[PDB]
């Protein structure tokens, strides 16, 4: 099993860990901030997914410094993760294209 597939697998596991830790820590950052909506675990988890995929729905977002710090890590993990799957598919196609010219 090639590096690029191990890495994509790793990045998926690591992103799901980031989405759960992020759920938990967003609620922990945002409770105590009057007006905050990112304060129960289930919608925190939905929030973490729409943040990682950079969907920017705009139904939920953090209003505190530590919530926003948590948000930044989730976004970076999401963009890296999905970038790494792209790199992995590039490698696969470059390989399949070497072979298809008998290199």
């Amino acid at each position, epitope marked *: 099993s090639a590096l690029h597939w191990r890495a994509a697998g790793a990045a998926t596991v690591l992103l799901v860990i980031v989405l759960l830790a992020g759920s*938990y820590l967003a*609620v*922990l950052a*945002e*409770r*105590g*901030a*009057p*007006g*905050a*909506q990112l*304060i*129960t*675990y*289930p919608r925190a988890l939905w929030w973490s997914v729409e943040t990682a995929t950079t969907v920017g729905y705009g139904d939920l977002y953090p209003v505190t410094l530590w919530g926003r710090c948590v948000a930044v890590v989730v976004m970076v993990a999401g963009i890296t993760s999905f970038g790494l799957v792209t790199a992995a598919l590039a490698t696969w196609f470059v390989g399949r294209e070497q072979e298809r010219r008998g290199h």
Partner: antibody
Amino acid sequence: QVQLQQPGAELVKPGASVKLSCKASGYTFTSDWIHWVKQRPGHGLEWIGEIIPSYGRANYNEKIQKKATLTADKSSSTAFMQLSSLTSEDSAVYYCARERGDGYFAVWGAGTTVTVSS
Amino acid sequence: DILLTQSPAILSVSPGERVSFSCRASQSIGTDIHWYQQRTNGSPRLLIKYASESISGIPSRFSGSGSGTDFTLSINSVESEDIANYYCQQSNRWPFTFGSGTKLEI
């Protein structure tokens, strides 16, 4: 089972403080928040504050004079509320309740009647 | 902070009749409203969560409806054991807040 056990009563001299206890049983999660709610006789429910025992962070009602300090003992599954410098304004039933981090008080203690009097 | 208005304070009904308790939020809170029953000398008891969801242990007689700002807890065919104060509570925005309460009177 009784999920939340509170002492029936505390008498407190005016000016003095008191620690209320709240010993939890049944399922405990990392996610669990313990809340405290004040009810004066013939009056409604007043949210005082919350603590997350797994991390020990606490938040308080801004809109009222801060009387309370919340702590928890991870090992003995007990949450504490230190009410300090009481007056007759502070005479009330104090409920503890458990929230699974999903927004609603699944279960309440039976409440501690706190009387401030000489 | 979200204000929950429960008007009227007292609701009189005859036995076996249907009754509706109102809860109005000062801004939209979707379906993040939960309802408690508190009998004389008793602690609160969760009846309905997220505006409409059953709790096991609660008579089918109880139901909830509403979204946004206007929420209703209903009892089809009231009976004596329903005599209590009924409170609403929001979990949309920090901090959680309670309605001032409505007494049912038969």
